[PDB]
Amino acid sequence: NVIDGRAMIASFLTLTIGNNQGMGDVEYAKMYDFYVPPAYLKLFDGPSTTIKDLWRVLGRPVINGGFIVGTIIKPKLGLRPQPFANACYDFW
C-alpha cells in the first residue's frame, strides 16, 4: 500500500496462483501450502477482534471460554422481518 506500506493478499494471489492457472502447456497445478517470513508476515493486518470478545460478552473466560452454541436462520430466504425475528427469539 502507498498509504500505509502494508501488504495486500491480492498481489500474493495474482503472482502465486494467477496467470499460471491458464498456461496451455500445463494440465493442472494446485497450491497445497505456503510460507510467509516475518518481514512479510508482519505487514498483514491479522485479526483485530477474536472469539475472546464474544466470550467476554457472554461472560465466559476470555481464555478457553468454551463452546458457543450457534445457528443459522432457516429458511435461507423467505422469512419476512417479524417471522425472522420470532425465529431469532425462539432460538435465543
Place this chain on the structure above:
Amino acid sequence: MDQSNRYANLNLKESELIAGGRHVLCAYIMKPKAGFGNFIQTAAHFVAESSTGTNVEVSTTDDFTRGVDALVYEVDEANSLMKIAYPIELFDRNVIDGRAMIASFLTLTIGNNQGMGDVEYAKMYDFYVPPAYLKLFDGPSTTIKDLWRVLGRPVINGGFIVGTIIKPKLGLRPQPFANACYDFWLGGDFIKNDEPQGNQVFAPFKDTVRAVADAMRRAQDKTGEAKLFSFNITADDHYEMLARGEFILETFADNADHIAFLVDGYVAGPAAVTTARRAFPKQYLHYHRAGHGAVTSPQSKRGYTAFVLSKMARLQGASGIHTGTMGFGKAEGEAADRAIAYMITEDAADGPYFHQEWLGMNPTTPIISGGMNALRMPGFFDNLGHSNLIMTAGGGAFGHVDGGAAGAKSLRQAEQCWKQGADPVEFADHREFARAFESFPQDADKLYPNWRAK
C-alpha cells in the same frame, strides 16, 4: 441541606457491590470545609453534585431518578476516606457504536464536585470498573509486541527498548534534527519527538518528516537493525492529526510499521487520544501526559492521582503511557509507583483500594522518562523488577560526552549490566557506560561514591 438519608447507605458491602457488576466504585480523599455540614452530609452533597441531584429539593424528581442515584457506602473520617458507588446507567454512550467514553466518567466522578463551595478538597485515588462497562472501552489495539516484532525481538519478553528524546526540546532545523536522529540510531532503537515538536516555522513538519525518514533508511542500512520513531501528531483539530499521520505513514512507506504516534493526552484531552486510537489502530499510540503534574502531584489534594490517570489511559486505548521514573529521576515520583505499571501491564491487579480484573484487555507499556541516564537505570530496574519496556533519555543520551551514539550504547550496556546482576562500577570493561560517569559526575558522585578510585 442534609441529603444523607437519600445519598448515603453505609450498610452496603463493597464485595456485594463488586459481585453485582452494576456499579463503578470510586475512592476519594475528601475534607469538608470548616463552617458547613459534617463529613457524611458533605459526602452526601458531594454524591448529589456528582450524579442526580443539586443543593436543594426539586419537584421534578421521581423514584426512577432515585433508583439510579450514586451512593456513599463507606467513609472513614479519621483518614478523610470516602467511597462512592455510581450505577453504570449514569455513564454516556456513543450513539454510533454504543461504546463508553471516559469523558462521561470524568464529568460524573471528578467534575463539578471539584468546584463545591462547602468542600475544601477532594481527590481520587482509585476506581473499579465492572465487566459490563469495562468491555465498552476501546482498550489498546497495538502493544510493545509490535515494536518487538519490528525490532526482530521475541514477541514475548522481547526486552529493553533503548530510546531517547530529541534535544533541544525546540530549535533544531530539519536536517540537524535528522542528523541527531541518525547519530542516536547508530547505537539505539527508539526516538521520539519532544512533546511540543511539530510544525514550528523554523522546522516545518513535512521537511522534517522527510529528512528523518531518510535518516531512518540510512541508519537501517548502516546498522542492519530496525529503528523506531514516535512522531508528535497532537493538534486541536482532528483533521490536522489525520493530515500529519497520513503524511507520515505514506512518507515512511515500507517503514510505516516502524512508526509510533505521540499524543499530548492530558492537555489536548481524551478526544485527541481517541482520534489517534480510532484513526490509526495499527500504529503504536504513545500517550504523553505533559501538564498532569498540576493535579497528580502529592502536593495537590484535588483532581486525581497518576495511578488513576494511567488506568484511564489503559481504558482510552494508549499503547504506552509515561508512568514516571518512580523517584529515580528529575520529576516528582515514588518507588511505590511500580504499582502503576503492574496495573497497566497485567490482566489482574490491585489498586490502593480496589482489585481490578482486565478480562484480556491489551496491556499498556510503562514508558520511563524524565532525567534518566546510563548511571541511574540499575536502581530503577531493581525497583520495578523487569525491563520489558521503552525508556527514553534525552539529556541522558545527548548529554553523553561522546555524543548520542555513545549515550545510546551506555544505556544499552546499563541494561545489560542490570540483567547480568553485576556491580555498575565493576561492570564499567564497557567504555560508553564508564564515560557516563564522566558525562554526569555529580550523579556519579551520588550513586557510586568511590567510582573514581575504581
Place this chain on the structure above:
Amino acid sequence: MDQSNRYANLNLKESELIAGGRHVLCAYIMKPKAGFGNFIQTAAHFVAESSTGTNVEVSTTDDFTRGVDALVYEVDEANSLMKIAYPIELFDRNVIDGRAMIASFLTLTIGNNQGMGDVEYAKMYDFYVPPAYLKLFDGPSTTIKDLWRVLGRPVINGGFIVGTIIKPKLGLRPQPFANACYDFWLGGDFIKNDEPQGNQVFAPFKDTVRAVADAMRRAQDKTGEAKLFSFNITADDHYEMLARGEFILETFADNADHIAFLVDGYVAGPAAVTTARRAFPKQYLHYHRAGHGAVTSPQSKRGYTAFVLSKMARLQGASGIHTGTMGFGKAEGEAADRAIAYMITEDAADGPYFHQEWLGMNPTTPIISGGMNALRMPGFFDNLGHSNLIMTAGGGAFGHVDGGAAGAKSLRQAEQCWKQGADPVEFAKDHREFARAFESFPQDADKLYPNWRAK
C-alpha cells in the same frame, strides 16, 4: 545545573517585549522546593523545561536554538512572582491552514513544568498574546447577538437571558424530561442539558431530542415567543460529536438556529471544543468547564486560574463560557471575578498582570450558574454592572415552590427589579412569582433580607 546565564535576562523591559509583538508573556506564582536551587536558578530550570532545554547540557544545541530560547524577564521572590517571555516561533501551527493551537500553548507554558522535582508549586495567573499569534486563533464565530436575534431582541444590549438546567441531573426519561422543558419554557428563554445528560440507556439521545423538539414547538406555539436549548454533544469520538450535532439540527429543522451545542471542554479537552467550533461555526458553542476546580481553586497552587481558562476559551472559539457566580452562589468564587467577564466580553481589558487588546475578536458570553436564584440575583448584578448575559438556575427554578415556570418568571422579575432600581421586598409586593421565591428559599431570604417576613 545552574542555567541562569542562558535562560534569564532581567534587564528586559516588559513594555518593549509587548511593543515587539514577537513574544507571548506569562506570569506565574512559583515557589522552589527546599533543598534545591534558589529562586532565579529554579526559574531558569523552569524556563529550560518549558522551551528549549532540559536539566543538563546537550551537545546538539546550536546558536539557532539559543536564538529561540524563552526568558525570565521579571522576578519577585518576596511575592513568589515569575514572568517568562516565550518567542511566538515556539508555538505549533496547523499544516493544513497555518493556524494556532492552544494545545501547544499548554504543552509549553504549563506542561512538564508542573512535574518538576525542584519546584514545590507553580501556577499561571495571566498571559499576553501579541497580534501575530493572537490573529492565528479561531476566536468565537457565533455570539450572544445571535441568541438575542433569535429571541427577537436588539442585537445590541439585548438584555438578560433567563435560563435553567434540567434537574434531576440524571434520571429523567425522554418525555418527563421534555415535560420539564415545556414547563420551564412557559416563563423562561433558555434551557441547557445538565453536563452529563446525553445517551444514557434509560434516556436514549434521539428520543429525548425529538421529545424536546416537540416541547419547543408546543412552547413556542403556547407563548408565541422563541425558546432556546443547549444540547450536550461532548464525546471522546469526534464522529460521535458530529453525529449528535447533525441529528439535532436536522431534527429541529426550522428551529435549528434556536440550538446551542454544549461541550465539556475541560475534561474532554480543547480538541472537542475545536471539533464543535469548526464543525458547527454557525451554532452557539457553549463551553462547560466541569472539573476545572481541581486546578482553578485558590486552594490549588498548581495549573492555572479561572481567568486564564476563560481567556483561553475565548481564543478557542467558545460562544459562551461559565464564569461562576462571583461569590453569590454555591460554588467557590470571589467578587473580583467580575474582571473575568470583562476580559471575555470587551475588545480591550486588563488582567492581573497584562493588558490585552483583542483586535475585534468576537466576545465570549459570561454564562452564570451554580446555586443561583431570584433572591441572590440583585447583588450579582450590582457587583457585575450589567445583565447582558445568560443565567441558568437549575435548583433556583425547579426548586421554586410553584414549579419551573414560576421560577423562570421569578428570575425574569428579579432582573427587571435590578434594572428598575427598585427595592426587592417592596418590589415583591406586586410580583407574586418573585415573592414566592422568598418562601421557596427562606434561609437565603433570611440572610439577604432580614425582615422580609414582616413585610
